Ligand binder design. Structure first.
Ligand SMILES: O=c1[nH]nc(OC[C@@H]2CCNC2)c2ccc(F)cc12
Length: 351
């Protein structure tokens, strides 16, 4: 092939995000049976149907036994095959079981997107597949220069917002990319001047990123159980890098993660301390803020292209009986996000 003139970091990013074997590995991690439900047989309607059954299982547990539950739990396993051999699979009988399976289905949706991009499309040997795959993202990806002002600000954000309670690892920024999802800026226009626009973190596993860059960050579908998400079906962000970085699900086999920085249009925040499984905001509110016990020092907010960057070190928020150790931000309309940066991170696991 012609060999590809994309910068080396952008090429390594494309290789990571389209890696078929990482997809399979993520699926086997969820205890999916690849013999019965392989990567290519995965589809939107089957995932949607699984989401619905999980909503039924949600319904049964809300209103209380292990007898009428058994049936609903088995029906989940009928739609998404799990690898339990000659089995009896574990009973899905509580809220933890529902959260956990709904998070799996979120990820399968993005893996299906990634694989459909690979299998749709044309085959041409004289093109570098790195170039072919890049183009399917419909995203401009540029390397940010290590000495720029924006680089300095990003690395400070990363440097100051690592929580003491997440000290089992630390992070080094390997590559910073500036990203522009096609049409996203246009989508964001109504919100672009809104008050309380903040640059915030979103971590996800690497096998979601092809999906995220082609479709943007998305809200879970109507079929998904709203109870499987602490603040219901929105798009979730943190102001502490380590809280988002935990969602990369890195470890000691797969050490590199990917994390986003988006401009999020929060406007009037609906401030909450505990789980609230809403599907719409109170009139007048534009976001939810889950109130952390600790917050980036508000005095240290700095500005980057007109957006607040809450990069102060963590201090007491003053909030008392909250479920959350750190802040969480949730929007409920996809147009309130404009993705700005993508970081490739190395996790140094101290344990
Ligand atoms: O960076 C983040 N990535 N993903 C998060 O959540 C993914 C699942 C959907 C919301 N609950 C779990 C998530 C939830 C809270 C938060 F502050 C950050 C993040």
């Amino acid at each position: 092939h012609m060999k590809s003139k994309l910068p080396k970091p952008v090429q390594d990013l494309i290789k990571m995000i389209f890696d078929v074997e990482s997809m399979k590995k993520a699926m086997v991690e969820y205890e999916i049976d690849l013999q019965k439900m392989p990567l290519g047989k995965l589809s939107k309607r089957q995932i949607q149907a699984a989401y619905s059954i999980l909503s039924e299982v949600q319904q049964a547990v809300s209103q209380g036994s292990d007898s009428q539950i058994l049936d609903l739990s088995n029906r989940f396993y009928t739609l998404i095959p799990h690898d339990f051999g000659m089995k009896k699979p574990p009973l899905l009988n509580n809220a933890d079981s529902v959260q956990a399976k709904a998070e799996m289905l979120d990820n399968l949706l993005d893996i299906e997107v990634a694989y459909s991009l690979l299998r749709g499309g044309s085959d041409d040997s004289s093109k570098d597949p790195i170039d072919v795959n890049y183009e399917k993202l419909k995203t401009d990806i540029k390397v940010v220069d290590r000495d720029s002002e924006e680089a300095e600000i990003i690395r400070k954000y990363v440097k100051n917002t690592h929580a003491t309670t997440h000290n089992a690892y630390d992070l080094e920024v390997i590559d910073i990319f500036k990203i522009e999802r096609e049409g996203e800026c246009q989508r964001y226009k109504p919100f672009k001047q809104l008050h309380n626009r903040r640059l915030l973190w979103h971590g996800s596993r690497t096998t979601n990123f092809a999906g995220i860059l082609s479709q943007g960050l998305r809200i879970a579908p109507p079929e998904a159980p709203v109870t499987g998400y602490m603040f219901g079906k929105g798009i979730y962000f943190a102001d502490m890098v380590s809280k988002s970085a935990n969602y990369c699900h890195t470890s000691q086999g797969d050490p590199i993660g990917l994390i986003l920085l988006g401009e999020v249009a929060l406007g009037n925040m609906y401030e909450l301390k505990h789980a609230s499984h809403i599907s719409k905001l109170p009139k007048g509110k534009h976001s939810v803020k889950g109130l952390g016990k600790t917050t980036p020092d508000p005095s240290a907010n700095i500005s980057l292209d007109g957006v607040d960057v809450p990069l102060g070190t963590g201090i007491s928020s003053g909030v008392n009986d909250t479920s959350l150790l750190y802040n969480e931000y949730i929007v409920y309309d996809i147009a309130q996000v404009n993705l700005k940066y993508l970081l490739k991170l190395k996790f140094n696991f101290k344990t």
